[PDB]
Paper text:
The bacterial RNA polymerase (RNAP) is a proven target for antibiotics. The switch region sits at the base of the mobile RNAP clamp domain and, like a hinge, controls motions of the clamp crucial for DNA loading into the RNAP active-site cleft and maintaining the melted DNA in the channel. Here, we used single-particle cryo-electron microscopy (cryo-EM) to determine structures of Mtb transcription initiation complexes in three distinct conformational states, including a complex with Fdx at an overall resolution of 3.4 Å.
The second class comprised Mtb RbpA/σA-holo bound to two us-fork promoter fragments but without Fdx to a nominal resolution of 3.3 Å. One us-fork promoter fragment bound upstream from the RNAP active site cleft as in the previous class, but a second us-fork promoter fragment bound the RNAP downstream duplex DNA binding channel, with the 5-nucleotide 3'-overhang engaged with the RNAP active site (as the template strand) like previously characterized 3'-tailed templates. Local resolution calculations indicated that the central core of the structure was determined to between 2.8–3.2 Å resolution. We will therefore call this complex an Mtb RbpA/RPo mimic. In striking contrast to the crystal structures, both cryo-EM structures reveal density for the RbpANTT, which unexpectedly threads into the RNAP active site cleft between the ZBD and σA4 domains and snakes through a narrow channel towards the RNAP active site Mg2+. The most N-terminal RbpA residues visible in the cryo-EM structures (A2 in the Fdx complex, R4 in the RPo) sit near the tip of the σ-finger where it makes its closest approach to the RNAP active site, too far (25 Å) to play a direct role in RNAP catalytic activity or substrate binding. Assigning a clamp rotation angle of 0° (closed clamp) to the RPo structure (blue), the RbpA/σA-holo clamp is rotated open by about 12° (green). Examination of the high-resolution RPo (closed clamp) structure reveals that clamp closure pinches off the Fdx binding pocket - Fdx can only bind to the open-clamp conformation of RNAP. Using the ab-initio model (low-pass filtered to 30 Å-resolution), particles were 3D classified into two classes using cryoSPARC heterogenous refinement. CryoSPARC homogenous refinement was performed for each class using the class map and corresponding particles, yielding two structures with different clamp conformations: open (Fdx/RbpA/σA-holo/us-fork) and closed [RbpA/σA-holo/(us-fork)2; Figure 2A].
Numbering used by the authors:
A (entry chain D): 441 to 1012, 1024 to 1090, 1097 to 1128
B (entry chain B): 1 to 237
C (entry chain A): 1 to 226
D (entry chain E): 27 to 109
E (entry chain C): 450 to 1136
F (entry chain D): 1227 to 1282
G (entry chain C): 30 to 56
Write the structure that this text describes.
Amino acid sequence: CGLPKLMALELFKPFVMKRLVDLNHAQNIKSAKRMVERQRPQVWDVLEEVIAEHPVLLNRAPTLHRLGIQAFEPMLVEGKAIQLHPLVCEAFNADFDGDQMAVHLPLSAEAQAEARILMLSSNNILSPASGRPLAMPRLDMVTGLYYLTTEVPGDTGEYQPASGDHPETGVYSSPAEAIMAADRGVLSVRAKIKVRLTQLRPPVEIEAELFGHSGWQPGDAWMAETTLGRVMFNELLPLGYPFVNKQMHKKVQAAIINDLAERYPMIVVAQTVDKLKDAGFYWATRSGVTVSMADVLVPPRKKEILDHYEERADKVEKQFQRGALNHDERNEALVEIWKEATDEVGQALREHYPDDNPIITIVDSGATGNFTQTRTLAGMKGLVTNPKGEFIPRPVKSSFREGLTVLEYFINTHGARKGLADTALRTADSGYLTRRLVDVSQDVIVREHDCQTERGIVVELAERAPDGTLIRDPYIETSAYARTLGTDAVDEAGNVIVERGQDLGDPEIDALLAAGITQVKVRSVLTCATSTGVCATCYGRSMATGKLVDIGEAVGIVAAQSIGEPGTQLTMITGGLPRVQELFEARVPRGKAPIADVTGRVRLEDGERFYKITIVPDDGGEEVVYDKISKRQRLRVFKRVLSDGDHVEVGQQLMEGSADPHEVLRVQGPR
Amino acid sequence: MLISQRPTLSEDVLTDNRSQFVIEPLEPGFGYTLGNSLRRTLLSSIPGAAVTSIRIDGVLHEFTTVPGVKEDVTEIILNLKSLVVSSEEDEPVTMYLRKQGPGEVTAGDIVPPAGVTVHNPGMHIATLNDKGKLEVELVVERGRGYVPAVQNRASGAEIGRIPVDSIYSPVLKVTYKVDATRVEQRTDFDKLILDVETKNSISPRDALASAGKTLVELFGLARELNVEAEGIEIGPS
Amino acid sequence: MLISQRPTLSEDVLTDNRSQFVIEPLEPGFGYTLGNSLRRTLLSSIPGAAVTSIRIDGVLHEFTTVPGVKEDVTEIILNLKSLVVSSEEDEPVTMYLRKQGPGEVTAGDIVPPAGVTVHNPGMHIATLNDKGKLEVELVVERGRGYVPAVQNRASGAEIGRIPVDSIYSPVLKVTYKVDATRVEQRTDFDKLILDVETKNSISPRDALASAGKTLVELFGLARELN
Amino acid sequence: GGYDTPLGITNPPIDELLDRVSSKYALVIYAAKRARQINDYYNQLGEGILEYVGPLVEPGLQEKPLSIALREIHADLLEHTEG
Amino acid sequence: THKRRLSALGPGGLSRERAGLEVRDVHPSHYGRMCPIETPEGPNIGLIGSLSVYARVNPFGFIETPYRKVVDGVVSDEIVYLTADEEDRHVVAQANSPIDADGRFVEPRVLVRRKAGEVEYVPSSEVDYMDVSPRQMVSVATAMIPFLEHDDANRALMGANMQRQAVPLVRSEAPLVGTGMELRAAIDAGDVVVAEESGVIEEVSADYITVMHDNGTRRTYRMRKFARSNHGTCANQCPIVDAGDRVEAGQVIADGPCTDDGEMALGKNLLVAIMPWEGHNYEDAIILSNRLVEEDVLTSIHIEEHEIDARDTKLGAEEITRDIPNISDEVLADLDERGIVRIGAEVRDGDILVGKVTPKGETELTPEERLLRAIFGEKAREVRDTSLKVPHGESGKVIGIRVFSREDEDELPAGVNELVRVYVAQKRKISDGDKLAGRHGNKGVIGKILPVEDMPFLADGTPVDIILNTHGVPRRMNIGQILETHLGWCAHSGWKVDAAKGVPDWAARLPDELLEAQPNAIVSTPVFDGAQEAELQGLLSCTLPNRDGDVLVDADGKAMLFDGRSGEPFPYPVTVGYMYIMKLHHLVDDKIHARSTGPYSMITQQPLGGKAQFGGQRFGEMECWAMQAYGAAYTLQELLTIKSDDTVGRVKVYEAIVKGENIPEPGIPESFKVLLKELQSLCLNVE
Amino acid sequence: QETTRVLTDAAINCRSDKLNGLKENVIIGKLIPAGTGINRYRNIAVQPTEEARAAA
Amino acid sequence: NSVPGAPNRVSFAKLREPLEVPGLLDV
Ligand SMILES: [Mg+2]
Ligand SMILES: [Zn+2]
């Protein structure tokens, strides 16, 4: 990281005050102090000596997760601004519109070792919360690599073959010949050709049929039908890595950097990520992505869509003015009509745009933004919320390219200010939750290697189908990945397929899914058997390092920060951050839904305008009676729907809403 | 004027024909005014010879089949474009390549006429299976840069002759980047880092001096407008 | 096949202070790089002369007013930062500006010493009434590029001297365009058309000759030295 | 394996250093104690001789003793015992 | 806009933390009285607003708003000022309604606003009021945004709040494309000298303008030159009339700080491309050209004020004199014989401004210093040395010295013999780290200043001046910054709508004398009635050639730029235009701070805070949680003991660093031993 | 939280502390018991192998 | 408009307004 030379001269003052007395530049410490304070021209040759290989901690408030403090090595940069690397900005959540950062100087040998080994910027690529790479390319680098590695059909100098009177004229002896051709006007970078690569490892499907027994590629030739741009991408990736040949989205690059973090050492991933950012900036500046008002194409049939839905709304308003339906019913009917109009103009705008538009390439490459904002750019703003929170039934039919009128802009200001006030109050509320979570869970640290318990939770892990062998559960990478087995897995009399104590990575999960077993008992921290703290094998793999957790990690603070950091992006019986605050404070919810105490038959009775539910057991015994459930709380579907004439399970929920955790602890136990 | 420093060209030698050069320190910003020109004049201005057009007997109707050998014509073509050959007759001079019987044909089976020479006789081109005689005729000539497939404008004299692409450049792949050495004492200078790979006809040290000659003969067209004009002078060795 | 013929440079003169240069024929793909390597040396490294520091009689610093004139001192600084002046000697020479009475102090009232000259007698500097007297000396130096105001503390000058930024660059605007012929029988060439416009201090062919001299001096280092 | 030539702080690489210790905390205390021994050598050297030995690798011109300690660890020249 | 501000907090009003979400939102009765856009951004949204343009305050304290009453569907001109109570009793039409030449609406149904805030659609007989204009809902600062109705309200809020933070440049060029609110927000703000009665200019000079009225007497207007503002910026004031001109009553006679010919000019017109260039304009950063540093396009003047006072102490009197205790004769070169510096002397960080020396009474020296006095032969000099030196990081010239004295009957407080203030000027250029911003809420700091040779230039060789990023345009929904990029090109070069066979269909509703325009013409798009999207596309197709016949910008608005660094053209065209950017007051020189060792606090010995003192950066709670989650015990213990509180560890670490030894083990923090005393003073036996 | 009513019933019970979490070692200025602060990591003894002390 | 020494700045306004902007510091 760059450092201003004035800030580094005042920061490193006793070190330069020592070194310019070890060199004969001052008589003593007092003349050295005067020479530094006067900024005499000899001290800049000494500051580069005393600054080399001396790391500094950079920190940006607020420090949401533990990656908001990172150590860098410095290098003197003229000016008065700290030059940050463009890849760590995801970790700091820093934008360059005027943000400030603090610089600290570690003095002792222990603090220098901790800055050089523990908190270096290139040792922390992945996140401890999820495991995804946080130093992946983003906004400009993604569209640079997307313009590089895409394939345009019918481009310049494609693979022709029209043999019969002339040869194919799409082959190349090497990527060097293709680069020499593209330096003339003959080849485009995004044109499909057939190079002959002698230094890139082929994919497994091609190397298996070409060499098989030893498919090494330092010097053996194979022909590849790709673009030139995918060759210039794959030259950035390491030597043993197989050739990819895909259009680089953001999910594809996340997969590539995740595989590099799994299989390759930690110093290879950092250099690869640096090469990717260099090629990404160089191709984003050639990509030709500019915004003009001639690029904001309006849909050519917006007017007839709005006329048809305005006719439907006019019939609804005529039925309301006649007297057929009341106030709230015509409000809901207008809301439904204009929601359908919004989605239909969204489909028309989506199908009108070319696939190489500069506004739609930024969305489709996963660089930034989403589609709905583009639908508010060209098209229709849609419905606008109230200060109360309800919907205005008007709605805003103009776009931000056609420009809004006076009244539609004044309506839009309601939600546009309510969102800003809610953002301020929400980031006020999230820090209190992070503080309470750190305070309740600071003594959960790793204490020993293995406590050798045999208890463990079970994982859902890819339910059957209807016949159907086994489709995956959607959330496997958050509940079953990076754990340890409590029991040996066994197929249908089979053998031990995955033995006890393995890391449950990707090939073990695919082997368990091939073996046809859909449930796995997994060792966890809820059942750990140590006295103080947890054990290493009960905790599992630490998500940041990629291997097993060490025996001093304060995993309680990491666990509190991983929940406290994304709380600002939680907008919203409750659904947003008050729901998390209600669950972690173990309060009784306002939409409290009753649960059953025992199996049996439910007598559902109406009465004095709320409800009555009495469960009668099958054993039997004393019946259970819940009297007053208000009419706003609708009953609860699973299996027709609940009503009467029904069989109840033990801990079955009876209404929709939120069951309080005290009753389910009292009835169904801690597990 | 006076430069008040001096750049130095100092070669670092990698593998046999892949040297890497550095030029430091240039006053800002002179890395880009000379690095791109040096790369382009390395690539497109050194003379050299290559193969332009080949003809194989009994190959007219289907241009991916040779009777008796393993490779189709779209592989024997690109095994011939990577054939480094220096010629002296500035005119098309033809060579022949004929071989019978089973065995692996190399580049040293070619018969060079007076003047031309093949600088890698151990380059494999085809593998004759059994009892199939291959007879190729090559055309070697000089030029520069890579000039693509010139179409057969003879229109009737050449029946089975096919034209291939021409890699006339003795260099193959040149890349450059600059840096920012010594921002305080030397006050934000540059450092141009060339990286030139050659084929084995000439060294990457001899290929840098030829483009230096063709460039100092090229900016001398502008210097011969007013001789006693004042520009930045460097100084002697 | 190599075209064995050397490129020749020819010149068209459009006005007195701008011209065009045609260089032909080049290799295909070599017009843009040659034109840009000439532009980047023309726009940065052509030596000229500019006024370094001025000193007025009644003032002590840059942030005051002179009694009688219409502009303050910083406006006279911004008006003097557009003078074009071609010196001929190494030492800093001084030129004088004395005016008394109502009128308009222009740039044609500067009396220069032997060797230097002023190339725009129509530039307006200040305007005076009957109570105004403008007496100011200027220091004309020689250099290249652009260097900001050398501080008074980092020199030996007294209170009266006012450092001014200096722009030693005679050229104003340089562009090009190529004519890539590239016929489809592979006898291809380029045709570079440079367009140079200077600020009346040097002729365009005297601006191109020094850029050619700098590039001949620098690209010769990559010759058989190594 | 084969990566590149690393520059600056990240040389020797932290992957070929964690083959020598148990975890990355032991590397911190290892390098810290070895650098304190080298710094105690460089001072009781401008007086009588003493027992604190080092450096065991030929250093640079102005090399910090922590980097000297890391290069001694990387070349398998020291041993350690955890408490 | 600091006046006309309606704040809700204060004495007798609500608080900042005890304020709910109800007062912060925009009520529907805010239309025409308070602006929904302009409000602060921090923890004050909704609590501070500003009045509208046409609003007016009742004698009781309520806010009125004008309306045109319409009788029998015919809009009259009897302008009534309604309050918010009786606005709801009637119905109010919309301003952009098709009145047909008498007062009659063209369409039989009008848009309208009902009682509860509902937006109905009512036939044209129940309508009894109309707005007097569009832009009636909007404030003074918000009405100076061209193309307001294409921006989202968050970005329009930021654009209205970043116009009152711009600095006054030294040249102040008028905007090439604006609204109609520039000329009226300058002559009413009062920072422009306006001629009182109609006269004829007799004598102009940079200090004063004497005009001669038609009836006898003269009047002299005294311009204030280089006055310090409240925030450090300059207040220069220059005339714009010559010595023979005829003026009228109300005519602007002298420009102000941010004015040009009587209208507001906050920034400059700069050629902008919207390409992303090499990752230097990455994630809101802005790169510039070096032309703006060479030609002083964004140079400002900043004036600082330093004050010292000689008082009467208990031991005598503090004296301001050149006779200073032990100090070199080199650091006394600029001071005159009576203390203070000379006007015109250039100072830097550490130089003495006012030589002040205070009596010290008594102390006894160490034996080493008493030996050192006896060797060299120097007296004890019992008076102290408390001079006035400039603070760390500042420099510049010296404009003025204002000295008040007790001996000359000046009004000073009790026990103050002398009081001297010194003003320091500084001409700041633009630098990387400074904060620029546009009008449409776009902003960002300078990350790079390229030389003029490697900067994307057009076919003329004209380089561009700034290079903004693409990826900040679509997701922030402020594409009005594209539209003024287009019109700003047209107004740079001028159009000529060729109506040689007939006026074309796009220009059917244009006025006359917009059919053609000379180059560098200033135009004006008002707020909610401006240039349509179908007329920028017409003016872009006639964009008159520069010097040779050469249209540099095609009908899409994009141009073909060469590369300044490599030479070959960019493969696709790039939007260029002229944007109006402003230099904000978030400069780098006021923000950079560093501290090795400075002043410590009183009760607990932790360091101070802020750039006014020295102050250390606060290593608070969440940073401690991050360092604990890392596992770095030693860096946390070093940051919390020997850098803040360990009083004997602080000087021991400094000694060990200077002599070159190892950093010692930390002791106990001296803020923990204060806690034991405050717990023992609560009668708790903490042992 | 609630410093008064925690401090006033810690004093009635005569409740003692043992300093085992990493919030009190932060307060008193000691090393926290996590990471490089536990005994098995900070009680490492480092000495040159003999061959090297041997070869020096 | 209705200011005697104003620069001639052309307007795109399609409407006229009956009431002009008041004396902005009258609050
Ligand atoms: Mg920000
Ligand atoms: Zn365990």
